[PDB]
């Protein structure tokens, strides 16, 4: 290539504007660049990972730096209940005086924004107390950023370039990551909790300059090597302990108490320390499984190759999977993203119900922000997992080398899989929509008693088995004579059962028919999105309408108007369609979470319980109500600190609709229009003197789909974020 993009002369020889766009859009798809090899691929990916790490460290250091420099962290640690955490100061020369006055919150001497990332609760819980601590941490993470960049640059150099064989050493990387990255890190974090966090919560200032001079335990290190570990759990913090103070503080460092610290309404630091320690041990033991350079250990290839059931109901089983995974980075990225997405949702679900940060969960807006954040992140990550799924199926999958294994057999009965997903989605849709519409009609005709309200018996039963006594099923942990109850009666069950039956927190909230309905909506969402994604993955290589689709790649416009028409036939297009359904699904889940929790914090769950049974209830009592303050951020009379969220609300609506533009109108119209504009320019005097170097053309079909989807998603996210934050913080529950 003689011009941008240098990695593709095909695009470089494009005389049009496309050349630029695609240049930007294919910059990270290394596999499709000119003169690339496996080596360059892995090496560039490695360096790119270092770059990403550097960006993360720099980002975190930025957060720490700004909280320390412009925030009220100290004022917050002195009074976490009645201080709004400052994210950063704001200097906008576009501001008028009312704007300056309105945005001066907290103890600030000027306009600021209130943090809803919850970094205050986190940092305070783990041991940070002063601005100086934050500054030192910022400097350290900046140092880590520089180090990571240096490492990328280094390993890019010919002396430090790793071979492809090294990248394909799976057993070693698994051993090291399980034992070191997972194990040693968790053990070391337990170390931080024991040495810094726990003493900090007990009112003991422990830093680098004295941590060697202070005992983490009255009789430290003895009981560990003695085997008298129980001594580390002797006297935990009292039930009247005040966080950050010596009052009510114990001396234990490792416990399994369960439940929440009553003041902070979060998990016990000793519980978390013991947790991280234990899992550190499971990781460390589990990290010595695979064979390396010492003559012992397992061979993953052999393990896979051995797991084939006699009788052949799974064909050749897992024979050959080792190579087809270890050779295909896309398969690896698919597995990675799938797992990561699952545990991201897990993070949301566990962090809302079992908060681990002191004086979070009292901060309602922060909780909502966090849940929505992680659920949308999880959604996108999932769609991506299912996107690198079929890229594997197209770019990497070798049919012959996978003969009759679980994967090839998977492609065999694809119609069965897809058709059954279709049935599930169809059923759930028909009946959930049907029941909702039924109930709405009943409410309309003034007869809500005729509503079909199905009780969530199964989930309620699970809650009862977990020790909740609201439904009175009296099972397992709810049954006084149950062996499961007697087993841990004197360990975690006191605190746990105390927490699960305290109906002011989010630990196993009480559920009714509304919960049933919306849960089935969620089921519909999951099943349908997976229908799109799975169907797109399995038909990525071909279908009866296009048997040679694999010869065209992951992304292409279409195959033409022939054979009936082939719009949106590529696997990429399947992804693109699936994104709408993910946004819809997560929309429903976040709507659910937020409404239920707002009604919880407001003190009237009956609102949700009665109104969520019909869609007019969601529209009127959730959407329409909670926008009152939001839309009044600015008006003909004046403005307040919510003007940002109103402006952002409208911003989101606008971007969303522009998305509609790119999604509804297609290329040819615009191409011809642009032709008339080109004529116009070449025939306009004075302007004639100026000419373009890249011929103006309409965006491509796929490009249009992408840009449209991007406007749509951005609008979606920004709109809901503005509503979430404004509605919640406008009243703070």
């Amino acid at each position: 290539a003689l011009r941008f993009p240098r990695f593709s002369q095909g695009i470089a020889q494009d005389p049009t504007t496309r050349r630029i766009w695609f240049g930007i859009a294919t910059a990270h798809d290394f596999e499709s660049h000119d003169d690339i090899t496996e080596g360059r691929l892995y090496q560039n990916i490695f360096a790119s990972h270092f770059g990403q790490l550097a960006i993360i460290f720099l980002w975190t250091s930025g957060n720490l730096f700004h909280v320390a420099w412009q925030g009220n962290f100290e004022a917050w640690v002195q009074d976490p209940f009645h201080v709004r955490p400052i994210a950063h100061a704001i200097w906008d020369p576009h501001f008028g005086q009312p704007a300056v006055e309105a945005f001066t919150r907290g103890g600030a001497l000027g306009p600021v924004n209130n943090a809803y990332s919850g970094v205050y609760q986190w940092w305070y819980t783990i041991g940070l107390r002063t601005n100086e601590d934050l500054y030192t941490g910022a400097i350290f993470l900046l140092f880590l950023s520089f180090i990571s960049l240096l490492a990328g640059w280094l390993h890019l150099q010919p002396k430090w370039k790793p071979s492809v064989s090294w990248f394909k050493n799976a057993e070693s990387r698994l051993n090291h990551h399980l034992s070191g990255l997972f194990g040693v890190s968790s053990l070391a974090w337990a170390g931080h909790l024991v040495h810094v966090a726990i003493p900090g919560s007990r009112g003991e200032y422990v830093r680098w300059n004295n941590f060697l001079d202070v005992l983490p335990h009255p009789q430290g290190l003895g009981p560990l090597l003695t085997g008298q570990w129980n001594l580390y759990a002797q006297n935990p913090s009292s039930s009247n302990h005040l966080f950050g103070t010596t009052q009510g503080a114990g001396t234990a460092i490792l416990t399994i108490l369960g439940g929440f610290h009553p003041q902070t309404q979060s998990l016990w630091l000793t519980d978390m320390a013991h947790h991280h320690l234990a899992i550190a041990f499971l990781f460390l033991i589990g990290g010595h499984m695979y064979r390396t350079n010492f003559g012992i250990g397992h061979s993953i290839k052999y393990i896979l190759e051995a797991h084939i059931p006699p009788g052949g109901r799974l064909g050749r089983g897992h024979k050959g999977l080792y190579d087809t995974i270890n050779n295909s980075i896309h398969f690896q990225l698919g597995l990675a993203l799938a797992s990561l997405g699952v545990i991201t949702s897990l993070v949301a679900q566990h962090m809302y119900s079992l908060p681990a940060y002191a004086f979070i969960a009292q901060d309602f807006t922060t909780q909502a922000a966090l849940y929505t954040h992680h659920q949308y992140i999880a959604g996108f990550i999932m769609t991506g997992a299912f996107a690198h799924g079929p890229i594997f199926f197209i770019r990497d999958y070798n049919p012959e080398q996978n003969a009759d294994n679980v994967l090839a057999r998977m492609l065999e009965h694809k119609e069965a899989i897809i058709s059954h997903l279709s049935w599930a989605s169809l059923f759930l849709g028909f009946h959930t929509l049907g029941l909702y519409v039924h109930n709405d009609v009943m409410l309309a005709f003034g007869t809500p008693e005729k509503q079909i309200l199905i009780e969530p018996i199964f989930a309620q039963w699970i809650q009862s088995a977990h020790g909740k006594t609201t439904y009175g099923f009296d099972v397992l942990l709810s049954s006084t004579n149950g062996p499961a109850l007697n087993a841990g009666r004197n360990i975690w069950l006191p605190g746990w059962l105390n927490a699960i039956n305290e109906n002011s927190n989010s630990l196993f909230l009480t559920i009714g028919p509304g919960d049933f309905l919306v849960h089935h909506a969620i089921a519909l969402g999951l099943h349908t999105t997976t229908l799109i994604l799975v169907k797109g993955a399995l038909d990525a290589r071909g279908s009866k309408l296009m048997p040679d689709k694999k010869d065209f790649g992951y992304s292409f416009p279409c195959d033409g108007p022939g054979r009936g028409g082939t719009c949106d036939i590529s696997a990429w297009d399947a992804f693109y369609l699936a994104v709408f359904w993910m946004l819809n699904t997560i929309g429903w889940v976040t709507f659910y979470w937020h409404w239920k929790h707002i009604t919880l914090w407001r003190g009237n769950v009956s609102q949700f319980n009665e109104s969520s049974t019909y869609l007019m209830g969601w529209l009127r009592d959730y959407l329409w109500l909670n926008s009152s303050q939001l839309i009044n951020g600015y008006n003909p009379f004046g403005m307040n600190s919510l003007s940002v969220w109103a402006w952002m609300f409208l911003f989101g609506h606008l971007v969303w609709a522009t998305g509609f533009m790119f999604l509804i109108s297609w290329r040819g119209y615009w191409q011809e229009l642009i032709e008339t504009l080109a004529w116009a320019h070449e025939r306009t005097p004075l302007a004639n003197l100026i000419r373009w170097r890249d011929k103006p053309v309409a965006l491509s079909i796929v490009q249009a789909r992408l840009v449209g989807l991007v406007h749509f998603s951005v609008g979606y996210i920004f709109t809901y974020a503005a509503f979430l934050i404004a509605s919640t913080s406008g009243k703070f529950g």
């Binding site: 011009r3 941008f4 100061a89 200097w91 020369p93 000027g110 170097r693 890249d694």
Partner: peptide, 29 residues
């Protein structure tokens, strides 16, 4: 408030001008 009056117009006006000009020349070459 002192530094922001320096850094904000720096990052909001100067930086994107320099970057856009540079990228323009780079892409046009």
């Amino acid at each position: 408030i002192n530094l922001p009056s320096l850094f904000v117009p720096l990052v909001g006006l100067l930086f994107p001008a320099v970057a856009m000009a540079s990228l323009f020349l780079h892409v046009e070459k």
